[PDB]
């Protein structure tokens, strides 16, 4: 959270993209039954949320 606030808006935007891609691949693996660490999903969801929050605080 404090680490996110360090980054620029554009850099956060790119951090989101990565997390969105990560979340997508987790959901993919999960559906194909190839995901063990299913707790990863919630973390990534929360992370995305956190990043959007900081960006909206910037404005």
């Amino acid at each position: 959270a404090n680490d996110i606030r360090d980054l620029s808006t554009t850099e956060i935007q790119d951090q989101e993209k990565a997390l969105k891609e990560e979340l997508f691949n987790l959901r993919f693996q999960l559906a194909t039954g190839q995901l063990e660490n299913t707790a990863r999903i919630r973390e990534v969801r929360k992370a995305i949320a956190r990043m959007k929050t900081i960006v909206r605080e910037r404005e």
């Binding site: 969105k20 891609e21 997508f24 959901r27 993919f28 559906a31 194909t32 039954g33």
Partner: protein, 90 residues
């Protein structure tokens, strides 16, 4: 965004039986048009989409001891990639 439009792949005896016919079955957003799906799949998998067939599944009624209710309505897309395109994995 495109990964909000494609939810997850559909892995069934039917959906797996057409992975050789270059036809990939996805659960997509219930508001997503088949055009939105065609561009979503092209942005995520770097494939060239020939056609997208789509069907709406209404929720199925399920009881669990006195308490009855409906499973979620689904939108299922079957994306046929061209003969020269790369293949999606599953």
């Amino acid at each position: 965004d495109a990964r909000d439009i494609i939810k997850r792949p559909v892995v069934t005896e039917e959906s797996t039986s057409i992975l050789d016919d270059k036809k990939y079955t996805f659960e997509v957003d219930t508001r997503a048009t088949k055009t939105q799906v065609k561009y979503a799949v092209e942005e995520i998998f770097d494939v060239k989409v020939a056609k997208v067939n789509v069907m709406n599944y209404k929720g199925k009624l399920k009881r669990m001891g006195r308490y009855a209710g409906y499973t979620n309505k689904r939108r299922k897309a079957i994306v046929t990639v061209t003969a020269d395109s790369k293949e999606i994995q599953f």
